[model samples]
Target: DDPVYDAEGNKLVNRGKYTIVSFSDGAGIDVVATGNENPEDPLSIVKSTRNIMYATSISSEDKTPPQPRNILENMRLKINFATDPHKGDVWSVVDFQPDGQQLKLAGRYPNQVKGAFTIQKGSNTPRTYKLLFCPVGSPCKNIGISTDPEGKKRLVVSYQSDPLVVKFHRH
Candidate 1:
């Protein structure tokens, strides 16, 4: 099978679930879309952002001396400062747009998103776990590439379906 390509040579969007990952010398987070909150399937791509995230990360710890810190430290659990302090780790998405350009997802508790998703998607789930996110026609750009980081030219990106996942799940 061959992949679709746009005029600019970018890959076209197909039936696939997106994936996002950030990595380093010894740290990273890897998440794959397992489906939606729907009943029929899991990992189904639903264009939304209220989803908290994914698979695994470069686990770490605080080797300091303290009570809670000492209690949880050295446990070798994941220590992601980015999403931990920011949004309690509830920002997942699906770039299901043409060429997978848009991110649509929902989850977490914020800005009435909790109440909104509950009123619409139902109360079967928690107030935080609900279908919610950027309304139609207002998608924020979802990619970042850095070439100055050790001059290795790296791309930090988020997608609904990663290439391998796309290739694996393609129909």
Candidate 2:
């Protein structure tokens, strides 16, 4: 019952789900992760392409278009803090560019933080978040927690949430 079809009648994986689509400035391709099945939870999409990574609640059933926002060009990296942020909680952080030549930070507003911020297993309720990058010459983004190392833990609701670590590569 594959609902995705390409021009050649081939099955196309949707943006979210077990299927991932990678894009270049001029071309793009689709990557299907192993053990991809119909996801029971809507907020189970983790994507990384080039030097950009983002996690969101993307559903095939939902037809709402993503709100257009400015893309953080030359995005050195990004990190997320929310096992399940509430619908209006805003989380921000300052990230350094890979080259160390530029320092630009971004912010993400989780529309909802559900599941109390547990990764392994949590609530199935879907929450929405807006990822906003702080442009150059702007005030540093407001990072909810001040002290935390990258990759050590996530900024979840409880248990000293570790920050989401995302490394960027030149596209």
Candidate 3:
């Protein structure tokens, strides 16, 4: 029941705009919307581009937005984009054919394809946080980046990969 705080120690309020950065090196995430035709399928992708990543929060159960309540740890959240290209698109893990799981912007609200995610306080890094994907009746996996054979860094949910350490910078 701990309230989630930003890098400056401010409680994160619902629907607050924020930028995320890697805690170790201060790198940013790149979110891009792909031209996928299916309306129910994911239309956006994520990568480690080391630039400012703009995002907003949505509380679980599709509650009213722009509410002035503090977001808490382990609270399910729909981390959506506040940037122009993929604005309002929510981050999710998609099964990209043949059992490949990767992070992407799937959909929003009643049409979202995946479950909401959780933000837990870091165990090692003080004031940092770790993103987690915990499917119902399944174990949770830390969300982080993994390098593909082509050397591109893609955000993924895995038990073995190192979790991406991050700090929330509220706007």
Each candidate: what lDDT?
Answer: 0.24, 0.23, 0.69
Error of 3 at 140 (Å): 1.5
Report the Cα lDDT for residue 107, model 2.
30
Ranked by lDDT from best down, the candidates are 3, 1, 2
lDDT of candidate model 3 versus the reference: 0.69
Window of ten residues with lowest summed lDDT in model 3: 33-42
Please give the lDDT score for candidate 1. 0.24
Cα lDDT tens digits, model 3, 9-100, are 88887778878778987876675433342534535455555464666554553576655387788887777778776677767777665425
Q: What is candidate 1's CA lDDT for residue 25?
A: 20
Tens digits of per-residue lDDT for model 2, 40-104: 42222223222323232222322347621211222212223222332222223222222111111
Give the local distance difference test score of model 2: 0.23
The TM-scores, one per candidate, come to 0.19, 0.18, 0.79
Error of 3 at 86 (Å): 1.2
Please give, for residues 1-75, the per-residue lDDT of candidate 1 as tens digits: 223222233442321222222221211222223323233322222222343333212121333444121111112
